[PDB]
């Protein structure tokens, strides 16, 4: 299911972050990477370059403490879709606010920050 943002996903080594906004996957402005609204859900793709030339992928869907069911449900589904689009090469990780993995937390050089708020539910 090729979505415009999927066409951009995992092209080069690096980090990509999208926020779930009303049943759609919206990119987060690169200057806001690391600043997570606790009322939202996000999808993070971490592309790492492999010797052979191909890339390694890790898909993390981050769930804010107050995100609505539609947002967390969509983040999970978009994560399955992105993985499928990337030929099933991504390892998927569920990241809950306050309980993120060392790996995920490590993607943010100056440490990630939480901020109250977010976009309204899509229901």
């Amino acid at each position: 299911v090729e979505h415009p943002e999927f066409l951009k996903a995992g092209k080069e080594p690096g980090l990509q972050i999208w926020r779930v906004e009303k049943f759609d996957l919206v990119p987060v402005p690169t200057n806001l990477y690391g600043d997570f609204f606790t009322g939202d859900a996000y999808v993070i793709l971490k592309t790492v370059q492999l010797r052979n030339g191909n890339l390694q992928y890790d898909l993390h869907y981050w769930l804010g403490n107050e995100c609505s069911q539609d947002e967390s449900g969509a983040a999970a589904i978009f994560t399955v879709q992105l993985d499928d689009y990337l030929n099933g090469r991504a390892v998927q990780h569920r990241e809950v606010q306050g309980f993120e993995s060392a790996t995920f937390l490590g993607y943010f050089k100056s440490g990630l920050k939480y901020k109250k708020g977010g976009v309204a539910s899509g229901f």
Binding site: A41, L63, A76
Partner: protein, 362 residues
């Protein structure tokens, strides 16, 4: 822009609605009624049972009568949802391991009979997992006639590890009827069975320790509750409150040789790659009407904790809205901006026929 519909075909209750809504607009009995001596569907058929013979076209989540199923779908579109089906993409749910032939038939009916512009079939348990915000976990889906244990990894169910307990809500309602007799109470007619159902849904609970709970009910009247029948009479329920749902864990109560739901879950987990079992134990999602008993999550936690190594972190997820988890999950999926790609279109159906369902819907 197009509005998709979502229909979850339960064996006892059908849930229908519009993608984007947080709850189904219509919930009604999956019954088709015909003159005992045209037809009716849902609540009306149930009401007119005095003059109609009722039929349930869905058994254990599997459709057994396609003419009746069509009647139910026709009714759902025109009467319950008040839509013209040829104007809406339709997402339908199916039981895990739905026979290949049935998937094609459901597909054929939607396109040929109802002329849906697009359609999609999703496994019930997978929709529930999605609704819980997870791509990996094991779902324990218990509704009317069966309880399924469905291990899912990274968005996809593991067919080889899917198991089932042929015991669910209707069996527990049946059991309550029976054990209530030993107390003296007699419930045998339909309206009476509805009372027993209400008693099960309002006063039953799963005890954390059954033997200790029975001892408590026997040596005290502390666990007793009073129920008021619609005919003024006030009856008294004792250990039947927990003995009823205890059947899920002890199927022998219903003379079944099968293992309780905690063991079925464990067994399904043990059939999966050892590398992913940790993720299943840590994400046991309960869904379905029969998982609504108070205390069931604590009991599932205790039983699973007892079967798995003490190192294993057991987590039971039992959302308050779990009766509609499957439907909510479908509403979300159908609402995604990427859903328009996933569905089977008329064009595709016309070109490939019913079998296209095996290539477009896992």
């Amino acid at each position: 822009d197009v509005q998709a519909l979502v229909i979850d075909n339960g064996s006892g209750m059908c849930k229908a609605g519009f993608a984007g809504d947080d709850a189904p607009r219509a919930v009604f009995p999956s019954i088709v009624g015909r003159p005992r001596h045209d037809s009716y569907v849902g609540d009306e058929a149930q009401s007119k049972r005095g003059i109609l013979t009722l039929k349930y076209p869905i058994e254990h989540g599997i459709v057994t009568n396609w003419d009746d199923m069509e009647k139910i779908w026709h009714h759902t579109f025109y009467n319950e949802l008040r839509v013209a089906p040829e104007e809406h993409p339709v997402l339908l749910t199916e039981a895990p391991l739905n026979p290949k032939a049935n998937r094609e038939k459901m597909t054929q009916i939607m396109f040929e009979t109802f002329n849906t512009p697009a359609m999609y079939v999703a496994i019930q348990a997978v929709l529930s997992l999605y609704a819980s915000g997870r791509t990996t976990g094991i779902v324990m889906d218990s509704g009317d006639g069966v309880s399924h244990t469905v291990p899912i990894y990274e968005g996809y169910a593991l067919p080889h590890a899917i198991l089932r307990l042929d015991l669910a809500g209707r069996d527990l309602t049946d059991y309550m009827m029976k054990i209530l007799t030993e107390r003296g109470y007699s419930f045998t007619t339909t309206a009476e069975r509805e009372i027993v159902r209400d008693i099960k849904e309002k006063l039953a609970y799963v005890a954390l320790d059954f033997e200790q709970e029975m001892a408590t009910a026997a040596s005290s009247s502390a666990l007793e509750k009073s129920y008021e029948l619609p005919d003024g009479q006030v009856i008294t329920i004792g250990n039947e409150r927990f003995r009823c749902p205890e059947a899920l864990f002890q199927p022998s109560f219903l003379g079944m040789e099968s293992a309780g739901i905690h063991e079925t879950t464990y067994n399904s987990i043990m059939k999966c790659d050892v590398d992913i079992r940790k993720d299943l134990y840590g994400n046991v999602v309960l869904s379905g009407g029969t998982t609504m008993f108070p205390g069931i999550a604590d009991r599932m936690n205790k039983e699973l904790t007892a079967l798995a190594p003490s190192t294993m972190k057991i987590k039971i997820i039992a959302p308050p809205e779990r009766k509609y988890s499957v439907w909510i999950g479908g509403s979300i999926l159908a609402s995604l901006s990427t859903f328009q790609q996933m569905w089977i279109s008329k064009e595709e159906y016309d070109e490939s026929g019913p079998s296209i369902v095996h290539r477009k819907c896992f």
